[PDB]
Scaffold this active site. Structure first.
Site, PDB file in Angstrom:
ATOM      1  CE  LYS A  72      -7.036   1.839  -2.611  1.00 13.67           C
ATOM      2  NZ  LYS A  72      -5.958   2.809  -2.313  1.00 13.67           N
ATOM      3  CG  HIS A 115      -7.150   1.572   4.717  1.00 13.00           C
ATOM      4  ND1 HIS A 115      -8.445   1.457   4.297  1.00 13.00           N
ATOM      5  CD2 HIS A 115      -6.501   2.348   3.787  1.00 13.00           C
ATOM      6  CE1 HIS A 115      -8.588   2.139   3.165  1.00 13.00           C
ATOM      7  NE2 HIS A 115      -7.429   2.698   2.840  1.00 13.00           N
ATOM      8  CG  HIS A 141     -10.120   3.697   0.529  1.00 12.77           C
ATOM      9  ND1 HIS A 141      -9.171   4.475   1.168  1.00 12.77           N
ATOM     10  CD2 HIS A 141     -11.323   4.326   0.754  1.00 12.77           C
ATOM     11  CE1 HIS A 141      -9.744   5.499   1.758  1.00 12.77           C
ATOM     12  NE2 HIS A 141     -11.059   5.412   1.551  1.00 12.77           N
ATOM     13  NE  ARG A 182     -11.330   7.514   7.285  1.00 12.36           N
ATOM     14  CZ  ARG A 182     -10.797   7.941   6.153  1.00 12.36           C
ATOM     15  NH1 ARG A 182     -11.525   8.561   5.250  1.00 12.36           N
ATOM     16  NH2 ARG A 182      -9.515   7.792   5.941  1.00 12.36           N
ATOM     17  CB  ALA A 234      -6.414  11.051  -2.467  1.00 12.14           C
ATOM     18  CB  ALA A 240      -2.049   8.452   1.248  1.00 11.61           C
ATOM     19  CG  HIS A 297      -1.992   0.970   1.223  1.00 11.42           C
ATOM     20  ND1 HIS A 297      -3.217   0.722   1.776  1.00 11.42           N
ATOM     21  CD2 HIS A 297      -2.063   2.222   0.705  1.00 11.42           C
ATOM     22  CE1 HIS A 297      -4.009   1.766   1.546  1.00 11.42           C
ATOM     23  NE2 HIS A 297      -3.310   2.714   0.969  1.00 11.42           N
ATOM     24  CG  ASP A 322     -10.763  10.051  -2.181  1.00 15.10           C
ATOM     25  OD1 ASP A 322     -11.560   9.662  -1.299  1.00 15.10           O
ATOM     26  OD2 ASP A 322      -9.692  10.710  -1.869  1.00 15.10           O
ATOM     27  CG  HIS A 379      -0.651   6.659  -1.385  1.00 16.71           C
ATOM     28  ND1 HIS A 379      -1.847   7.151  -1.935  1.00 16.71           N
ATOM     29  CD2 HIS A 379      -1.005   5.752  -0.463  1.00 16.71           C
ATOM     30  CE1 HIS A 379      -2.873   6.544  -1.342  1.00 16.71           C
ATOM     31  NE2 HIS A 379      -2.397   5.686  -0.441  1.00 16.71           N
ATOM     32  CG  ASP A 400      -2.562   4.537   3.425  1.00 17.16           C
ATOM     33  OD1 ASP A 400      -2.487   4.986   2.247  1.00 17.16           O
ATOM     34  OD2 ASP A 400      -3.710   4.505   4.025  1.00 17.16           O
ATOM     35  CG  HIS A 433     -10.840  13.820   4.377  1.00 18.44           C
ATOM     36  ND1 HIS A 433      -9.848  13.005   4.898  1.00 18.44           N
ATOM     37  CD2 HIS A 433     -11.475  13.075   3.434  1.00 18.44           C
ATOM     38  CE1 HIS A 433      -9.869  11.830   4.288  1.00 18.44           C
ATOM     39  NE2 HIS A 433     -10.856  11.844   3.407  1.00 18.44           N
ATOM     40  CG  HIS A 452      -9.191   5.587  -2.963  1.00 24.56           C
ATOM     41  ND1 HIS A 452      -9.973   6.584  -2.439  1.00 24.56           N
ATOM     42  CD2 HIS A 452      -8.126   5.500  -2.136  1.00 24.56           C
ATOM     43  CE1 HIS A 452      -9.417   7.069  -1.345  1.00 24.56           C
ATOM     44  NE2 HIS A 452      -8.302   6.397  -1.129  1.00 24.56           N
TER      45      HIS A 452
HETATM   46  O1  LIG Z   1      -7.079   6.245   1.221  1.00 25.72           O
HETATM   47  S1  LIG Z   1      -5.559   6.341   1.913  1.00 25.72           S
HETATM   48  O2  LIG Z   1      -5.311   4.544   2.134  1.00 25.72           O
HETATM   49  O3  LIG Z   1      -4.545   6.760   0.786  1.00 25.72           O
HETATM   50 NI    NI Z   2      -7.181   4.158   1.454  1.00 30.95          NI
HETATM   51 NI    NI Z   3      -3.821   4.686   0.660  1.00 32.27          NI
END
Ligand SMILES: O=S([O-])[O-]
Ligand code: NI
Ligand code: NI
Ligand SMILES: O=S([O-])[O-]
Ligand code: NI
Ligand code: NI
Lengths: 100, 122, 570, 570, 100, 100
Positions: C220, C275, C249, C339, C170, C366, C137, C224, C139, C363, C323, C222
């Site tokens: 991936k 995660h 995610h 969360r 992200a 990120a 994981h 977002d 970034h 991670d 965020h 995600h």
């Molecule tokens: O959404 S965080 O695992 O980069």
């Molecule tokens: Ni994530």
């Molecule tokens: Ni991540």
């Protein structure tokens, strides 16, 4: 010593803070990177002292006041972030609006 | 409960090296005028010519000492050492070029040792 | 002649039954078996055993059972065992685990572990040797992250990104053919193994698949980018065709579905749940229930690992910062409170200890720390020993079961999840020689030497101007494996089968070793070494209480950790 | 119109008969001859001589006797002379030493040293210019060692290693075909010339020879791999066939033989005896007697150079640290006392001064300092002047004889020993343009600019953000010669003839200039420039007293050195 | 200044020692890299002062005691090595078992 | 802080000057790089204080005298140059023959 990459970098912050503290001691109003350096080193030393993240979020707002810095500096610093090794491992401290 | 990071806690007991192999004690003399130190895994018959001992008793053998250690002979010093048997294929190549094959060829080894002045060929 | 055990361990490293403390934890590992022949131990130096005609064979050419490299007297810690052996490397791969030296004169020499003219020696006596860590994981945000990873024993980075672009900041995503091609080229200069994830988003197959054919190693999904039922479904259809893994995610917001909806879209297909506890992302509050399912390969990211007194304060604020949340948008406060949950964080410690979460990851940059995956694994295991006791399965008072359970989380299990365990992830014959030497005092904290493809890539070493390498300052530094063209032969770029068949490496001029991703779709939880437990995890929607087999899983946060202020300058 | 000599030297550098102090030593070098035509000196800048139609020719294309680079007004210090000249470089090589400019209008212009449109200028007025140093005893342990070397004027590293593996930390050896191939690839990224030594160990030829065919430039026999009669013999048979040099670190322990036995195995064949004084290794106590023999090319390593009040204390402890010796294993104490000897260290100073030890080297990172070969050469020469007086051969009160004797030790002599003096090692026409500019105040301490293949590779230069390059901080920095693909054209990888014939460079994708090792087996002591003395050196086995021509060679240790605390921050 | 590579690196050690000395002055028990830094800088400054290698081998064993450092630190430091420019050039100092 | 490359480098000069000042304070005659460091940091701090280029050209000749430095140091330093941010932006200061 077994310095890792972050340990080497973070020595620079301590140094910059020492520089800035000398400048403050001789009566100068501090500038943007000077102010950031002082607050950042204070957070990292506080972690080393064993303070909590919550204590440092509070204290970091009282390290410099507006009369310590040049015009506009307070408003240029929205937050200061630092990671350091607390007794319970690395944590992130963010000091919000450190200089009012 | 004091913590030494990374410390060992060794088991009880002792470790026997070279277990099961024949041991032989021999006397050895440094007849030279400079120090000679001999490692654990050198074919014993091929050590420095100026060490005097019964060369035949070094054939197929090495020092019975912990791996990576050595025995020291100061100039003129005579002492006893304990040897163990070589293992594996019991062949030696190179070193002093006395063997270059099986350690079973004692006469050949000794002949070469004698011709080249390795002291103690009897 | 006999040697006492203290002196034997000082000279050769520990032997059968001997225990070694891991750093400043209260974890002890015990030597299970030893491949040596006592008295014929290999060692190197003046008057030592590995010398021509003695422990080094002077007859055989390189091809004739001779090694390129022998690590002498290693204490291996691996999913396969905790044991003492020599490790032999040739052509960049582990070829022999056993007993090295010279069959001329030594008993018990493994037949393809001859020390010969061609052989380099690393002394591993007194060291713990593990596989390189596999971080799935990552970034790709700041290239300075690579040395951070190497310094804590990580040798493979799987993830995505194009640098400090918001998508990448992200999400572990390198989107589309062009960004993928560009980052495969960039990878030529990174001294670590790499695999790149494409964007697992779309409602048509072709936009997703073209990333795989371009050289992505996986996908991936995600939130977002829209962690919708459609994007989940399309990504897994692609993955099933392409034989690559999908990480997820999930939809924290529950916008298009709750957990059960995401599970329905997955439809029993294999997926790696990132995660899984959920502070790092996922259906609020119950995402961690994924870790009970047989088709889910569950990992944690590291900032929740383990549960400490500063964790919650740190994470609530970290989330607000990340965020851009405001303390007076009540929806933002509610989001954060939904969360970041002590109930699921504390349960996550115990789920790791029970073998229900199978993997660790970072991670990196990120919401996680590039150099703390290995660190935090061991801190978790130490906390669990203190709070839960030695587990049932232990004996002889050692912590071997726990140590195998936890080393698997960052070595073999991520490699199996990703389809790369044929190449990396464990110390086994036939795998790439990615090996990390640790002094026990620094175990899991600061690696001594990191070997990549059989050449040292990174080391803690001192003054380059000195007469010897040990004088100060001793710091982590890139070694010859990273220099010139050697960086190509010591590192692997992992790619899809289809991009390899289509000639992408030649098209892009990639000189790195090319690794093939495979056997990703035909696995499950049962294939996670030492961490294969499936169970119904219930997460109470009102209280966030986690139950397994009708028992609430809870533990306290700790005020101090080992592997922390004794070691670090900051 | 006449100019006084002080002002002339200030403007153009010194001329015939003028003397220059070397750093803060009491050594003075005197200009022997000058190639200029007074009044037609070349110089560059606003209103200066090298301008179109004037000192720069505006007619000729590059091919037409025009230079790529002119170093103006250099004070050359070389085995060939101490003299003033312009130096002309083209295609990376020194093509002209003489007088540069424009034949249109200047008298005395060397015909292939035309300054034309194609010509770059370096101002050498007031600088001392030497060949790049040739270090033939390099352990490749930490890549950070390269800049350390460049900063003290070293331009060629010959030795071995694979990074901080124990074999390499002890021995200058890159063992076997695979490690050799890997380190040739790594070399692509090192901004310095390199030649790699294979393991000079074995009892069959093929395991040794295959290293030469793989691209090794020579071999190293080291006691840590068994410096036995067989390994000596096989290595020298290989070397004689392959035309490469063999270095030796002999059997300190006298385990298989005394010195005479090692000499019998050598059997009159050519060999380079490393750290010949023996603190760095070799038959105890008498190894230094090798330096009397006609077939031996003898070098010192640098920590014994010169004999100082801290030397013995430092070395006894350094040896204990290096070999893990214990102060209560009486055999370890005896070993150390037999190896570290003031009697042979003091004699080593005098043997250098007499031209009986021909070479200097570092032993970088194994028992020697990567950046102090040049430094310590001059400190030795200064100590010997103070203790022994100007040598017989001097005149005019200058130290020219000593300066030529000592510069040869780290320039031409190692190059001749290694079979690379056709390419490097001196400032002569037809050799590669590896040149070091020194301010006299910093001579032998910190190089000003290091030119590699005619492009500056390393320089002491200041703030990169400044209006000009001289503001602080002035520090050593890699220059454009090290960047991109220019690193390939400015550096040489030295290889065996057989690997070159077999196409190894193409097989490995080597882009560096490839240099051929040759004419290594047909030389002896007599071929060592200014350092060609053969004599019977007697070393008393009881007292360690060294005698030459019946006279004990002894001198005192010094408490202070020049080229030390005036210059260094640490 | 003409800083070479070692001179640049070694400035870091001085800095780390200054950091550690501040930490000690405010009452903290020092950790592994802090202790190494203080002892190492002491050796290098001692060379600069013109002490002998033998003097520094002795003195380096009295710079920090066990009550100055965290539990386990003494036993983590088998030796500290530093090279510095003495009046007679670079030499290696090794302090054996500096903290008892 | 947003450190640029020059800001990072120039922190080294401050550090070297702090090192050198400690050495001077304990009675040592300073060497070449020590002297350069002290004078250079003085120029940069002076710019920060808001002095003029002309003031610093003058003052930089009185920071160290010959009795502060080792034999030959004065004659090794022909000039010291530094760029720093004055109130009116970056300027170059050159101190000529700083130590008589
Ligand atoms: O959404 S965080 O695992 O980069
Ligand atoms: Ni994530
Ligand atoms: Ni991540
Ligand atoms: O590396 S030492 O044996 O010259
Ligand atoms: Ni040697
Ligand atoms: Ni060496």
């Amino acid at each position: 010593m077994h310095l890792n990459p972050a340990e080497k970098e973070k020595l620079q912050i301590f140094l910059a803070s020492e520089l800035a503290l000398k400048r403050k001691a001789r009566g100068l109003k501090l500038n943007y990177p000077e102010a950031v350096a002082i607050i950042t080193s204070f957070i990292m030393e506080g972690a080393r002292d064993g303070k909590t993240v919550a204590m440092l979020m509070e204290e970091g707002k009282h390290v410099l006041t507006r009369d310590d810095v040049m015009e506009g500096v307070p408003e240029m610093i929205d937050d200061i972030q630092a990671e350091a090794t607390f007794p319970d491992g690395t944590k992130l401290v963010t000091v919000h609006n450190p200089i009012s | 409960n004091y913590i030494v990071p990374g410390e060992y806690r060794v088991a009880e007991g002792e470790i026997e090296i070279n277990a099961g192999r024949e041991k032989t004690t021999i006397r050895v003399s440094n007849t030279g005028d400079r120090p000679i130190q001999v490692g654990s895994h050198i074919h014993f018959v091929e050590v420095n010519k100026e060490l005097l001992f019964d060369r035949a008793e070094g054939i197929g053998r090495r020092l019975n000492i912990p791996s990576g250690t050595a025995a020291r002979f100061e100039p003129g010093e005579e002492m006893e050492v304990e040897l163990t048997e070589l293992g594996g294929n019991r062949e030696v190549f190179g070193i002093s070029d006395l063997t270059n094959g099986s350690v079973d060829n004692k006469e050949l080894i000794l002949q070469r040792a004698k011709e080249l002045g390795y002291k103690g060929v009897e | 002649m006999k040697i006492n055990r203290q002196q034997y361990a000082e000279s050769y490293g520990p032997t059968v039954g001997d225990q070694v403390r891991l750093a400043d934890t209260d974890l002890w590992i015990e030597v299970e078996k030893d491949y040596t022949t006592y008295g014929d131990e290999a060692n190197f130096g003046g008057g030592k055993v590995l010398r021509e005609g003695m422990g080094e064979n002077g007859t055989y050419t390189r091809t004739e059972n001779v090694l390129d490299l022998l690590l002498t007297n290693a204490l291996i810690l691996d999913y396969t065992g905790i044991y003492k052996a020599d490790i032999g490397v040739k052509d960049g791969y582990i070829v022999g685990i056993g007993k090295g030296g010279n069959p001329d004169i030594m008993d018990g020499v493994t037949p393809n572990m001859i020390v010969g003219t061609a052989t380099e020696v690393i002394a591993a006596e007194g060291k713990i040797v593990t596989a390189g860590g596999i971080d799935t994981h990552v970034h790709f945000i700041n290239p300075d992250q690579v040395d951070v990873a190497l310094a804590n024993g990580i040798t493979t980075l799987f993830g995505g990104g194009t640098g400090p672009a918001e998508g990448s900041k992200a999400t572990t995503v390198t989107p589309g053919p062009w960004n993928i091609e560009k980052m495969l080229k960039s990878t030529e200069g990174l001294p670590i193994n790499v695999g790149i994830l494409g964007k697992g988003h779309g409602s048509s197959i072709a936009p997703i698949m073209e990333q795989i054919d371009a050289g992505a190693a996986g996908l991936k999904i995600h939130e977002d980018w829209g962690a919708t039922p459609a994007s989940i479904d399309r990504s897994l259809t692609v993955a099933d065709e392409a034989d690559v893994q999908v990480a997820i995610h999930s939809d924290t917001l529950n916008e298009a579905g709750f957990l059960e909806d995401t599970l329905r879209a997955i439809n029993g297909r294999v997926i790696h749940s990132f995660h899984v506890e959920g502070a790092g992302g996922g259906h609020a509050p119950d995402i961690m229930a994924m870790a009970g399912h047989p088709n889910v390969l569950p990992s944690s990211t590291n900032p929740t690992r383990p549960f400490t007194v500063n964790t919650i304060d740190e994470h609530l604020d970290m989330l607000m910062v990340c965020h851009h949340l405001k303390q007076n948008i009540p929806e933002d406060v509610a989001f954060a409170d939904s969360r970041i949950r002590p109930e699921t964080i504390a349960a996550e410690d115990i789920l790791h200890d029970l073998g229900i979460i199978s993997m660790m990851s970072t991670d990196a940059l990120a919401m996680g720390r590039a150099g703390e995956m290995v660190l935090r694994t061991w801190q978790t295991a130490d906390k669990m020993k203190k709070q839960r006791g030695p587990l049932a399965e232990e004996k002889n008072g050692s912590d071997n079961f726990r140590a195998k359970r936890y080393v698997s989380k960052y070595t073999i299990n991520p490699a199996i999840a990703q389809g790369i365990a044929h190449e990396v992830g464990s110390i086994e014959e036939g795998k790439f020689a990615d090996l990390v030497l640790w002094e026990p005092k620094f175990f899991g904290v600061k690696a001594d030497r990191v070997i990549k493809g059989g050449i040292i890539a990174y080391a803690q070493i001192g003054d380059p101007s000195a007469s010897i390498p040990t004088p100060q300052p001793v710091m982590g530094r890139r070694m010859y494996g990273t220099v010139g063209d050697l960086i190509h032969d010591t590192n692997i770029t992992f790619m899809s089968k289809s991009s390899i068949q289509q000639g992408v490496p030649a098209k892009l001029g990639l000189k790195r070793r090319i690794g093939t991703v495979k056997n990703c779709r035909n696995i499950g939880k049962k294939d996670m070494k030492w961490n294969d437990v499936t169970t119904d995890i219930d997460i109470n929607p009102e209280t966030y209480e986690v139950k397994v087999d009708g028992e609430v899983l809870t533990c306290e946060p700790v005020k101090e950790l080992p592997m922390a202020q004794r070691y670090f300058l900051f």
